[PDB]
């Protein structure tokens, strides 16, 4: 390797010695890729080995198997897990692939060439080469487009995708008419992130999800071809720092947004994150509670329609601030919630009183009852319930784990933008190692 | 020939790895016992007989829940000596009686005196000003006011904070429920001191590290320094201009900057210590009578202050039965205040 | 040389000769922070009572409605609104907008943009002044905490009514309810946060006292020692070796920073890392991943539960939980 004597970077900043070593830097990125693939395989086998059919997926602390379930593997109607072999082969395939990925990372790091420029001009690059950088950007942009097309190919030609909104009950459904209209796609992208809109988190059917991934696959391929055949224009060359650490900060900022978006996706979305596998969302459980008591109180004999709560608002049913009939109580805040179990009981004006009074099916009552007892509330030591609970139930929702973890990662990677971007500008300008005592810029400035 | 004081002074103030000094004759014995008292109590001593609780690792507590709990309230303000009239030399019964708490509080308080004397003794030998000792006065005021003065004004040591992580949390929650300690303007000044000191610590550290002079060619800027150098290691002029245009006001005197970093935290803790002295006598800033009289006259007047008062009612009623077993409160369910449903 | 309007405008914006540095982040910071400041001052003094719980029970928070400085607050947006965007133009009248807690959303939204721009403005001046960056990185720690209590926690909880009220007494209500529903005291991140502020307060006093104790004699006793330092001095105003000699003997030699550059990084890293984690604590507890729950953890041989200090903490939590928002719950579980 190297040392601080010949580099100026200490061991705690040791990977910063790889900035201009293309070959060794390649090995590092291939090795960390092997680590990511290793974890996916290792956890997939771990979750399969620790999986019991007596309990739903969200009760067993599984976060990878729900992803495979949503792709329509080993699941039947209603979200029941019928087979676990597809989860096993997926875990093995990643685990074995990490071995070859690790070897290339280990080879390209220790034995392979230190720099790729002289021996392999195709792969060799210098960060200041705006053209070469866009070609690498363009190539890896195409492989992302192909990855997006794999999702639509599976949902349309290879088995299909799990549709929790499917007619006749949630099941694996082959998408045939994905929503590809520009108005729908642009509608999600440019709607507000606030309640009722929810930006892209509010995608509510698999036709839009697959139609959306068709746009992404097509944009990335065109964007990949565009960024291969062109080089940055004059306005781009004067608006960006063209260094290795600057490119890193650009991704750290972008990856930071994705981490926050994933955190909100796992917390709110019930289409790409079906509640049959990830458990109920926060809003779903709150709505489920009022639904459960409305059903019980109706059976005990009560006009839930005209039942008045202590505050004067409807105890079971009220109106949202726009007029829709919604469940009452503190769940009023979650009136935007839309789930495959409550939607059948929702007309154009909101909840249907006649449907809520005569046409509530037992599977709907069972779904709502289960969800309210598996609300995302839980503790760090995995004690389910509010903080004032007792140690009886060992449960924390997978949505709680996913939302909390990928928010923490999202925030730290935002600090990565701040750190690696401030340094990129300072290093390029030339004052990242301190103020020059000979010509301090402030001394030249006139007194304030 | 040299006298005894001079011979001992020579050995006590030898420049060794761990300085002893004269103050060490008080610090190290007491400090070791206070450290030993806490470890022994949190590992083997129980609070079953003084509090009806388990507070030792042996009983099954974590580092979070283990504590050295205070004596029972019937003991009053007894010093709870090993030879005292409560437990007469019976060590195992002394531990069950909570005498280990007074052991840690007493030997621990004298270790604080011994440590402040250690700061004065070392400062004089090194021939520097004694501002670190004046600073350590603030932690001492907090310890004296909270662990000593506060229970001395209450029924007994039972209401002092027990030496434990979760035990301190109970003490903190007790003060909100019974004293409205958040509303007290002296905790408010103490909060501003601690949050202000934390702000000053981060800003000064960041400002210095970001106005460093380039005294080397390595990216590792830590190595481009020498403690004996005459030149300043960072630009005060650049730092002053940065904060003058960002924040509007900046330090121009480096000496004033560091005294301020010492004044904010010390003044904050001292103000809190004044408030706890008031709480020892239940002289608490619990309520605003004007708003309480108003709220009693119209059932429409609502403020966040009145919402906190209702929260304190819940804390007192639901906590008293177990927190104060000596009171023998048998509150039936119907008499406890609770809102609708939840 | 600059003749074009934009060229002349961009030179003025990025000029370091302004009394207060405007920047490109400043053209975002100034309008947002002035908007939030003006609405805060008007609403704090004279704003009508706000229905925060959505139960048609208005809460007064303004000085002209019988509040003092301590109890006065900007009441969060109505629970009926939830996370819905509620600008002024979405209300039929300003009276409706004031009733439902509109100012809180306006202040919080423009304030969030202001502090993010203020963070960017801190980097920008450093670049213009040729300093190193990462003062903004240190400032990201308080920014993260502000977004956690104003933005993220309402996001996870599903309503801006659960954001921190903009007041002194309102803050305390936010903390007490937070303990009841999340047991923040037992969360390891508030623990790291407390170590951040207790440690930062300790290190601020230690650094300040050690430097003040090693001031080189440059004045007389009839004047302040501060007179010994002249703005722009090349030499050091205190002896670092003398302060290291004292601290290295108060505990032991290798527990002291003889490196002044290492010392100030530690002075910066410790509170910033601490406040980063406590900001993540509130953010995580926004998604109901609460603190440690050790209730009924210790049980005896026959199955009886032996209470601990955690169980006493639980009884306090039960008191706050049943009393917070008395008229807002119709069902036993506080899922929302």
């Amino acid at each position: 390797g190297r040392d601080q004597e010949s580099t100026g970077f200490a061991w705690w900043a040791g990977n910063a010695r790889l900035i201009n070593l293309s070959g060794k830097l390649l090995g590092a990125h291939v090795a960390h890729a092997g680590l990511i693939v290793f974890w996916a395989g290792a956890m997939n086998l771990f979750e399969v080995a620790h999986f019991v059919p007596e309990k739903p997926m969200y009760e067993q602390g599984l976060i990878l198997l729900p992803h495979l379930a949503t792709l329509g593997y080993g699941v039947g109607p209603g979200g029941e897990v019928i087979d676990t072999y597809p989860y096993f082969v997926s875990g093995v395939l990643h685990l074995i692939s990490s071995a070859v990925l690790g070897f290339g990372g280990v080879y390209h790091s220790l034995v392979g060439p230190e720099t790729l420029e002289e021996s392999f001009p195709f792969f060799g690059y210098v960060w200041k080469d705006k053209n070469k950088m866009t070609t690498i950007l363009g190539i890896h942009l195409i492989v992302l487009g192909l990855g997006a097309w794999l999702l639509v190919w599976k949902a349309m030609y290879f088995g299909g995708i799990y549709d929790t909104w499917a007619p006749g009950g949630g099941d694996v459904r082959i998408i045939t008419n994905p929503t590809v209209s520009p108005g729908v796609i642009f509608g999600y992208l440019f709607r507000s992130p606030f309640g009722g809109d929810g930006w892209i988190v509010s995608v509510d059917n698999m036709e839009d999800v697959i139609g959306g991934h068709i746009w992404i696959g097509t944009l990335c391929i065109f964007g990949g071809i565009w960024h291969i055949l062109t080089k940055p224009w004059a306005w781009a060359r004067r608006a960006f720092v063209w260094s290795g650490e600057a490119y890193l900060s650009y991704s750290l900022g972008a990856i930071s947004i994705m981490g926050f978006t994933a955190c909100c996706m796992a917390w709110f979305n019930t289409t790409a994150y079906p509640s049959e596998f990830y458990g109920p969302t926060g809003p779903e459980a709150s709505q489920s509670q009022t639904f459960t008591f409305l059903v019980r109180d109706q059976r005990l004999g009560a006009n839930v329609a005209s039942a008045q709560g202590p505050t004067g608002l409807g105890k079971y049913l009220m109106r949202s601030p726009t007029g829709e009939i919604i469940f009452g109580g503190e769940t009023m805040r979650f009136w935007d919630f839309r789930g495959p179990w409550l939607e059948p009981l929702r007309g154009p004006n909101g909840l249907d009183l006649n449907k809520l009074k005569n046409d509530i099916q037992p599977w709907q009552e069972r779904r709502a009852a289960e969800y309210m007892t598996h609300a995302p509330l839980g503790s760090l030591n995995s004690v389910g319930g509010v903080a004032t609970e007792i140690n009886a139930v060992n449960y924390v929702s997978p949505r709680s784990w996913l939302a909390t973890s990928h928010f923490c990662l999202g925030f730290f990677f935002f600090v990565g933008h701040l750190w690696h971007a401030g340094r990129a500008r300072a290093a390029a300008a030339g004052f990242e190692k301190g103020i020059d005592r000979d010509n301090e810029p402030v001394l030249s400035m006139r007194p304030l | 020939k040299r006298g005894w004081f001079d011979v001992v002074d020579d050995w006590l103030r030898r420049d060794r790895f761990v300085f002893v000094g004269w103050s060490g004759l008080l610090l190290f014995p007491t400090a070791y016992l206070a450290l030993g008292g806490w470890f022994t109590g949190t590992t083997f001593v129980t609070s079953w007989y003084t509090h009806g609780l388990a507070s030792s690792y042996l009983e099954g507590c974590n580092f979070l829940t283990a504590a050295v709990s205070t004596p029972a309230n019937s003991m009053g303000h007894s010093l709870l000596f090993l030879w005292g009239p409560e437990a007469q030399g019976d060590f195992t019964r002394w531990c069950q009686l909570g005498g280990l708490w007074t052991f840690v509080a007493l030997h621990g308080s004298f270790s604080l005196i011994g440590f402040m004397l250690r700061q004065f003794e070392i400062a004089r030998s090194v021939k520097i000003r004694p501002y670190n000792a004046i600073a350590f006065s603030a932690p001492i005021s907090v310890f004296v006011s909270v662990f000593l003065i506060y229970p001395l004004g209450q029924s007994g040591w039972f209401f002092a904070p027990s030496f434990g992580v979760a035990a301190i949390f109970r003490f903190i929650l007790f003060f909100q429920g019974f004293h409205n300690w958040t509303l007290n303007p002296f905790h408010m000044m103490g909060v501003a001191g601690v949050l202000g000191a934390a702000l000053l610590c981060a800003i000064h550290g960041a400002t210095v590290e970001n106005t460093l002079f380039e005294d080397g060619d390595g990216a590792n800027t830590f190595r481009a320094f020498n403690p004996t150098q005459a030149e300043e290691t960072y630009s005060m002029v650049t730092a002053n201009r940065f904060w003058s245009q960002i924040f509007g006001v900046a330090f121009s005197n480096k000496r004033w900057l560091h005294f301020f970093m010492l004044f904010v935290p010390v003044t904050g803790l001292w103000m809190s210590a004044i408030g706890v002295v008031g709480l020892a006598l239940n002289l608490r800033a619990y309520d605003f009578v004007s708003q309480e009289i108003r709220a009693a006259e119209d059932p429409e007047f609502e403020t966040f202050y009145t919402k906190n008062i209702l929260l304190n009612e819940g804390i007192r009623a639901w906590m008293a039965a177990q927190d104060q077993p000596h009171e023998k409160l048998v509150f039936p369910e119907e008499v406890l205040p609770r809102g609708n449903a939840l | 040389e600059s003749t074009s309007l934009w060229a002349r405008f961009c030179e003025w914006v990025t000029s370091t000769e302004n009394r207060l540095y405007i920047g490109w982040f400043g053209v975002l910071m100034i309008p947002t922070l002035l908007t939030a400041t003006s609405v805060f001052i008007i609403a704090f003094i004279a704003a009508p009572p706000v229905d925060i719980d959505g139960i048609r029970e208005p809460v007064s928070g303004s000085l002209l409605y019988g509040n003092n400085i301590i109890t006065g607050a900007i009441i969060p947006t109505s629970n009926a609104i939830g996370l819905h965007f509620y600008p002024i133009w979405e209300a039929a009248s300003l009276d409706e907008w004031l009733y439902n807690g509109g100012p809180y959303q306006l202040i919080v939204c423009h304030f969030f943009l202001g502090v993010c721009s203020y963070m960017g403005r801190e980097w920008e001046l450093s670049f213009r002044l040729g300093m190193r960056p990462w003062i903004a990185v240190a400032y990201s720690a308080p920014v993260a905490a502000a977004t956690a209590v104003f933005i993220i926690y309402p996001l996870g909880q599903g309503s801006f009514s659960d954001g921190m009220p903009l007041g002194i007494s309102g803050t305390f209500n936010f903390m007490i309810v937070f303990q009841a529903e999340h047991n923040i005291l037992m969360h390891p991140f508030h623990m790291l946060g407390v170590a951040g502020v207790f440690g930062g307060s300790l290190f601020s006093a230690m650094h300040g006292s050690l430097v003040t104790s090693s001031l080189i004699r440059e004045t007389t006793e009839n004047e302040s020692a501060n007179e010994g330092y002249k703005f722009g001095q090349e030499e050091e105003t205190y002896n670092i070796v003398a302060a290291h000699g004292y601290f290295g003997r108060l505990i032991f030699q290798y527990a002291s920073f003889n490196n002044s550059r290492s010392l100030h990084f530690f002075l910066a890293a410790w509170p910033v890392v601490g406040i980063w984690f406590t900001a993540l604590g509130i953010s995580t507890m926004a998604f109901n991943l609460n603190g440690f729950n050790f209730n009924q953890s210790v049980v005896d041989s026959q199955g009886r539960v032996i209470n601990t200090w955690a169980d006493i903490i639980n009884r306090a939590n039960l008191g706050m939980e049943v009393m917070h928002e008395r008229n807002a719950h119709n069902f036993p579980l506080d899922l929302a």
Partner: peptide, 30 residues
Amino acid sequence: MEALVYTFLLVGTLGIIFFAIFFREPPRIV
């Protein structure tokens, strides 16, 4: 009365901030 005294104290404190920033003693090198 209280509401008038609270407002004067608050705007009085804000007025001091304005003067401390713009009508400050300028820091002069040597």
